[PDB]
UniProtKB/Swiss-Prot annotation:
It catalyses: a (3R)-3-hydroxyacyl-CoA = a (2E)-enoyl-CoA + H2O; (2E)-octenoyl-CoA + H2O = (3R)-hydroxyoctanoyl-CoA; (3R)-3-hydroxydodecanoyl-CoA = (2E)-dodecenoyl-CoA + H2O; (3R)-hydroxyhexadecanoyl-CoA = (2E)-hexadecenoyl-CoA + H2O. It is an enzyme of class 4 (lyase). It comes from the Bacteria. GO terms for cellular component: fatty acid synthase complex; plasma membrane. InterPro entries: Fatty_acid_synthase (IPR003965), HotDog_dom_sf (IPR029069), MaoC-like_dom (IPR002539). It comes from Mycobacterium tuberculosis (strain ATCC 25618 / H37Rv). Keywords: Fatty acid metabolism, Lipid metabolism, Lyase. The keyword Lipid metabolism applies. GO terms for biological process: fatty acid biosynthetic process; fatty acid metabolic process. Residues 121-209 form the MaoC-like domain. This is 3-hydroxyacyl-thioester dehydratase X. Belongs to the enoyl-CoA hydratase/isomerase family. Shows trans-enoyl-CoA hydratase/3-hydroxyacyl-CoA dehydratase activity. Displays a broad chain length specificity, with a predilection for the C8 to C12 substrates.
Length: 233
């Protein structure tokens, strides 16, 4: 239950296209969330190879914790390690933790815990999220889970329309604030109601220190799509 890549190259053109579609800045270091996408093929090879029943197609992303110890340069080639751990019963199904460590040289730069489920007032910003943009996020980020792109498959897996990738939303909400993030930062997200597409969602931001609290809501109905914290280390 362990995957390794010794020297994964970074494609800057992909980093640019990731920043464009999520609304983040393309600079010399990759966005804080970008290594989710970079290591995604490595995570899915672990998930798809689970001995027991657990399907990547139609899987649900419930929670995500990123710890960045140091930025990763767009020119870096990276070491990747993934392990899967903490199978639990939930209610809606099987939960599992996928734990990824991304290294530059001998050092761990970026550390993530991803939790998946197999089913068994005026805002500080506004996000417009269309099916087209998410079709584009799926191409660029490489998560082709069809609940985000194929309506017929979304229905089959329980949703009335296609939904946004949780990690699209988790990237997009950092747009304004990311320029003030320190190099060492932790970002914790709890996904709630899926974002049904197309949608216009409002982001609420408080400065609960030394950092930020975030809540993304559906604008008509007001229910939460996610809550998150950003903190310096
Ligand atoms: Mg996260």
């Amino acid at each position: 239950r362990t995957v390794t890549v010794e020297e994964l190259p970074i494609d800057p053109a992909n980093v640019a296209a990731y920043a464009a579609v999520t609304g983040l800045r393309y600079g010399n270091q990759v966005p804080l969330t970008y290594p989710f996408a970079l290591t995604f093929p490595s995570v899915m090879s672990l998930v798809t190879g689970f001995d027991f029943p657990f399907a990547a197609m139609g899987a649900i992303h419930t929670e995500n914790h990123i710890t960045q110890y140091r930025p990763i340069a767009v020119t870096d080639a990276v070491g990747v390690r993934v392990r899967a751990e903490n199978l639990r019963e939930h209610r809606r199904g099987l939960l599992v933790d996928l734990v990824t460590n991304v290294s530059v040289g001998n050092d761990v730069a970026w550390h993530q815990v991803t939790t998946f489920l197999h089913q068994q007032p005026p805002p500080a910003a506004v996000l417009r999220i269309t099916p087209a943009k998410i079709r584009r996020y799926a191409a660029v980020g490489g998560d082709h889970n069809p609940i985000h792109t194929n309506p017929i498959a979304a229905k089959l897996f329980g949703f009335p329309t296609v939904i946004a990738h949780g990690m699209f939303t988790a990237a997009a909400v950092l747009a304004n604030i990311e320029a003030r993030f320190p190099d060492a930062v932790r970002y914790s997200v709890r996904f709630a109601k899926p974002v049904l597409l197309p949608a216009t969602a409002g982001l609420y931001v408080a400065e609960g220190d030394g950092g930020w609290d975030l809540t993304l809501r559906n604008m008509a109905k007001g229910y939460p799509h996610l809550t998150a914290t950003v903190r310096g280390l």
